[PDB]
Design a binder for this molecule. Structure first.
Ligand code: HEC
Ligand code: HEC
Ligand code: CU
Ligand code: CU
Lengths: 373, 147, 105, 125, 373, 125, 105, 147
């Protein structure tokens, strides 16, 4: 950091060495690489910070347009985003596009135009643009004029087509040609395409009543076929898609009865994270009125995903808005405070804060990690 | 109001046109004196009611009276306000509305009309609050219809 | 173009003509989702609830351009007169799960 | 205030995030950059499309339906930023969802978010 | 403001009135209209706030590109800027352009491309793009590959040509076809063009030695042919161009001998303002080391422009970076704090703070007023 | 510190605005966003062109010539922002002027400012 | 193109050939501002001061493209061999008041 | 070093080639014994010096020895380091350099050479610090040349 590169810099000089400037390359992608996206409160141009969560060092950055959807391949071979730019800053002719970037040089690999500006401009929901698990196709949601998901071939670098879908939202791909959506009615729809006319679409049953409200940020581990989906109360629905079909596991309660009696509820942005190897759930929680669900929260609960057994409750100390975890054996709990524009990196085991990376744009809100291998 | 008038207009409904073939029942007597239809939610009735509906009504209103050529009959908005009640729903069927929704006394006995009403009432997807046509015990076992 | 817009602003419900072809919008839906009318008829939608709703035909349905109609608020109306025959599909701009169709024969 | 405590609306100051017509506003109070309570700033485009909320008006004790229409075609104002979520529901319920950019229907397909206005569209107690 | 429009709003309701939303129009341009530009610390997209300095109300805004040069016609018939945008946010194909805006609707009136991207990208210096006094021509500076000023016809809405100029900087137009530049050597160059080949260029004499450093923000009242140009010490050079030729008036000292003995020096961004009707100079000052000239300053000195007589010394109370004044009979002293992103509006007579407008972008630095009539 | 007081350089922390090679830096320390003291972050373009300064190195007591080259083709980093003006002169003296975007000569005509690096180009006591 | 670039990196001063055609850059200027050479000669600039400087010919002078040369630092050199005859004007990229000319006859 | 050698090389300058027509003066005697040129800044000399310069030198070095075909002679950088001194400047003129800058003894008397040197020395635009060729009083009244 400073001190380190100063005694370095200084002594470089007392040893005589003069500087021949160059453009650096980012260290090869590892499991400790963490991506922070700053939507910047709906500003027309945004930034994504590439951080090495271990050393707590920003190691690169990427620029984007209005309200983009970041995507990271789990195996670390690229990162991409779907983005929107305008000829005169915030007005003029719209261009929606996907850009693909190499993850060592940060240089763009493909730039693919999406016709007729079809992206959905929403506060950022990680599962509204998704990679299929082979990494050759990107799917993104269109809300108006009618629900649809577009298919981008990242391999021959082209937009393929739009798929008519029912009144369903979020895209959870389970195979090269299949993904699930959660519908208005309370069901999940399975969409199989490559069925080159219209896709083949199937509903599961309704799994939550009309008055149970599931959040906009579900956690999905694609390598485990596992969807962890909280509700405003911290009841956690879990669906397993590893067979190809939706199997509804048992709903665990994330808050103790005494916490719900004392008014604890989940609140934040990316409120949940799921570690797949340890099979655990982390939830952001605090005491709040019923309808103060988007506010930051000061605790973190950890529970066993199978049993609902509460493993730990961390006292974070800052106001956190989003969490996520690295997917390795001894993981970090990434806690992002939009108000501090700072990323606190804690030990996921103990909840002990280890590092922080501050000055992370104007409104950072989304953390993305790759589940590597 | 006193009871039965044509809902758009010729006002008094005329019961001398009804078939005698079914005006005899306890249901029709009870309803004509009180405006209350005993077939609502009657598990006994409901399988005939569903077939009366499919033969005569699904063409225009759809299978679950969710709407097709003509309007949905399954929620709390009624183009004619009276239809929140069985007296008014009855008056729409006996008397007719406009268009292709004509008077139904020449195809249905009075007791068949109240059986079809109860299927319409069963197809409701709102909640027991505006289910004013139901008594408390009928509300207490009423479930919003799911296709 | 296949529809003339008669009043381009919503006007009030209690001014809809005596016995007009009417689609009510209530309980988040278009209560007569498949209207049939003849070449020359005017359809009026009327929004019976507080939640503002509109009618929106996309490009290539009524004309070269999409017609996003004006938002109606409670008890307001909005008409369209279909001059060619055909099935015209529409949805509600803020709420695209709300759909309907006019069939002009 | 504590951000997590319950919303106590006021009817005395419209630029304040607790001004009662702002119970499910996301974004920036239009009045802070040249608009009023119900009108867009100069140069912005008015959307027709909106999320709504029912806000309790502490003065006359009635809940009203607010239609949070956006003013669009400009980068965000950066002034009077509020996020209130009273009665706000997930994106699969779009009519009460406020993370969506409600700029649909604005002239020239204007889609960037400048600010939100708070017109009353009817009573809903 | 709030309270006012709340008792308004509230009662509007108790009187029954429902709202029919529209796009407002800005109140017609007056002498109290003040423009704040936020370069946003070299961010690729910027904002300009249009404020009514009297009521202390933001009454409009404009968006721009990277490091634009704002221009206001003195008579209030338009405002314009020369700007830079890129197809992919901060990289891609560059477009340099001028846009002209109507000052009541804020809508663009002309959008004129400048070929081959010739704008000079510098921290914002108000006199590097300038209107001729009839308002039909905009002139802007090009530094590389060779000094040149381009001529934009704002009336037939087109770029005309580039003028080769010597090694001179800033553009002070005195007539439809003439302007002055300050050269490296210490002279002013007079450039007369419309001489349709090369312009006719004349130097005045050297007016300041090589070791006297004149600031990047001189004040120029074009209606008075008056250039007030401070140095790092607060010595004020004044040149009068009202004849068509540069006449060097007497150099006044802005700081007392005791202030220079105690280490007072000017510091800030737009360090000077000149009221033309009262013929007065306002200078931003504080105690500083020699080379801390770009830092904010806490005082303001006022002096008679003719005599050098010190009229007043205000104790501003905030850290101010730029000042400027309205050009009317009883003027406001506009003080902008980049660090507070707030505009304090003081009485120019007494220095008494009257109003403030905060939340003015991320790095606001430039104030522009029109000298009306 | 008081912003107006004299510059006291240090040679212990390179992300600090008082690190000695940063005496006439305007903009953002490249090391704070993936670069080092002398190299651009991934994806940015290196300019050839620069303003310079002579900075006193408190450790070995010599002044050095720093060439403040910019890394370009990105929006600003927004981290480690410093403005130091030691020996900085007005725009009519361009070789020591630091409000100019020194991105000339960078690949693909890249001209937006991301950050500044601080290479030493020779001694100048 | 009218000039070949011999080494595209500056090389050191004490490696300039025995009695070569040389322009010194010192005291913010090109000390021989109007060099004449013959078709086939190689010019070497050498920067004698600490302040980095380069040579930059704009587009259409040496070729289709502008040649911005490498920045030289103290005591570094940089050459160009002119293969067509003509007056080639150049300036220094960070410092455009520094100018010169090669005349190849 | 002992005094006079050709600056590129044939080393000792040969003074037997000089014209006798002007080697007589106090200036030439003083300079040959001490290396000091008394004409520097001599207001007496300076109008002849300027004409000697224009006739013989401005063609290649320009009017104010700011440079043209050949290099500037007006600042502190000298391609040949010795020229910071009058001994070296003299050695460049007597002896010649390379090219078209040949030996000047066949057109100029020794005292005319020192008069031209003093005009070169007068055309300097640096500052009296590297004006090592000037004595303190000559530095004290020296002004950087302005065209
Ligand atoms: C298609 C040719 C129809 C058949 C057969 C039936 N109905 Fe109908 N119905 C139809 C139309 C076009 C209309 C509208 C009439 C108008 O004046 O607006 C209706 C309306 C009704 C209503 C009133 C709806 C309301 O919201 O108040 C009711 C209650 C109704 N229809 C009931 C109904 C039943 C139960 C039927 C089978 C016995 C039936 N309809 C047949 C068209 C058609
Ligand atoms: C044009 C044909 C020339 C005339 C006549 C004179 N000089 Fe010159 N001069 C010329 C060239 C091409 C060169 C370079 C020679 C080389 O070997 O590099 C020079 C150089 C000098 C120098 C040396 C410069 C340095 O920086 O050390 C001096 C002092 C010099 N010339 C002086 C000078 C005077 C005073 C002349 C008139 C009597 C004169 N030159 C004539 C080309 C030409
Ligand atoms: Cu709707
Ligand atoms: Cu240079």
């Amino acid at each position: 950091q400073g001190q380190a590169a100063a005694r370095a810099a200084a002594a470089d000089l007392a040893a005589g060495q003069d500087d021949e400037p160059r453009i650096l390359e980012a260290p090869a992608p590892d499991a400790r690489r963490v991506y922070v996206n700053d939507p910047a409160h709906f500003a027309a141009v945004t930034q994504q910070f590439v951080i090495d969560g271990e050393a707590g060092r920003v190691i690169g950055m990427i620029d984007g347009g209005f309200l983009p959807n970041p995507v990271v391949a789990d195996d670390g071979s690229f990162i991409a985003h779907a983005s929107t730019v305008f000829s005169r800053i915030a007005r003029g002719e719209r261009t929606d596009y996907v850009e693909v970037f190499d993850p060592v040089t940060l240089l763009p690999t493909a730039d693919i135009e999406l016709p007729d500006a079809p992206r959905f401009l929403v506060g950022t929901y990680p599962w509204m643009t998704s990679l299929t698990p082979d990494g050759k196709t990107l799917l993104f949601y269109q809300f108006s004029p009618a629900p649809a998901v577009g298919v981008v071939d990242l391999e021959g670098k082209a937009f393929k087509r739009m798929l008519d879908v029912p009144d369903c939202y979020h895209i959870f791909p389970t195979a090269p040609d299949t993904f699930f959506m959660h519908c208005r009615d309370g069901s999940l729809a399975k969409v199989a395409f490559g069925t080159e006319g219209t896709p083949e679409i199937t509903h599961t049953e309704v799994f939550h009543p009309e008055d149970e409200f599931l959040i906009n940020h579900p956690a999905y581990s694609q390598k485990a076929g596992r969807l962890v989906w909280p509700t405003y109360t911290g009841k956690i629905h879990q669906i397993d898609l590893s067979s190809g079909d939706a199997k509804f596991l048992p709903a665990v309660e994330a808050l103790t009865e005494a916490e719900r009696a004392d008014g604890w509820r989940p609140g934040g942005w990316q409120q949940v994270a799921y570690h797949r190897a340890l099979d655990r759930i982390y939830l952001l929680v605090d005491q709040r009125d019923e309808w103060r669900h988007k506010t930051a929260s000061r605790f973190l609960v950890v529970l066993d995903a199978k049993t609902g057994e509460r493993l730990a409750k961390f006292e974070m100390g800052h106001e956190i808005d989003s969490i996520n975890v690295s997917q390795d054996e001894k993981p970090l709990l990434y806690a992002l405070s939009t108000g501090d524009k700072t990323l606190y990196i804690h030990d996921a085991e103990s909840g002990e804060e280890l590092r922080s990376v501050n000055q992370l744009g104007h409104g950072p809100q989304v953390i993305t990690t790759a589940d590597m291998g | 109001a006193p009871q039965f008038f044509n809902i758009i207009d010729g006002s008094p409904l005329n019961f001398d046109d009804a078939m005698e073939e079914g005006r005899d029942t306890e249901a029709v007597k009870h309803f004509l004196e009180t405006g209350e239809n005993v077939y609502n939610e009657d598990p006994e009735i409901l399988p005939e009611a569903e077939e009366l509906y499919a033969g005569m009504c699904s063409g225009c209103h759809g299978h679950y009276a969710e709407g097709k050529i003509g309007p949905g009959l399954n929620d709390a908005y009624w183009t004619y306000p009276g239809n929140e009640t069985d007296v008014g729903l009855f008056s729409t069927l006996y008397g007719g509305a406009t268009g292709q929704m004509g008077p139904m006394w020449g195809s249905l006995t009075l007791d068949e009309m109240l059986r079809t009403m109860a299927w319409v009432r069963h197809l409701y997807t709102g909640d027991p609050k505006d289910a004013s046509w139901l008594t408390d015990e009928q509300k207490a076992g009423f479930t919003p219809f799911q296709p | 173009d296949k529809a003339t817009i008669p009043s381009e602003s919503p006007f009030a419900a209690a001014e809809v003509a005596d016995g007009a072809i009417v689609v009510d919008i209530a309980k988040m839906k278009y209560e007569t989702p498949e209207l049939h009318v003849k070449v020359g008829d005017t359809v009026t939608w009327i929004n019976r609830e507080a939640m503002p709703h509109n009618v929106h035909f996309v490009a290539g349905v009524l004309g070269e351009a999409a017609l996003k109609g004006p938002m109606m608020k409670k008890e307001q109306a909005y008409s369209l007169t279909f001059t060619e025959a055909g099935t015209y599909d529409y949805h509600c701009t803020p709420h695209p799960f709300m759909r309907g169709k006019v069939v002009v024969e | 205030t504590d951000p997590r405590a319950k919303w106590v609306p006021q009817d005395n100051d419209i630029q304040a995030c607790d001004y009662w017509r702002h119970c499910s506003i996301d974004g920036n109070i239009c009045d802070c950059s040249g608009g009023s309570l119900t009108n867009c700033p100069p140069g912005t485009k008015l959307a027709t499309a909106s999320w709504v909320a029912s806000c309790y008006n502490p003065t006359d004790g009635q809940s009203y339906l607010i239609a949070y229409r956006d003013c669009c075609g400009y980068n965000v104002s950066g002034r009077c930023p509020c996020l209130n979520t009273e009665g706000e529901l997930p994106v699969y319920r779009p009519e009460f969802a406020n993370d969506i950019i409600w700029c649909f229907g604005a002239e020239d397909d204007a889609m960037t978010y400048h600010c939100t206005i708070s017109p009353i569209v009817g009573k809903a107690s």
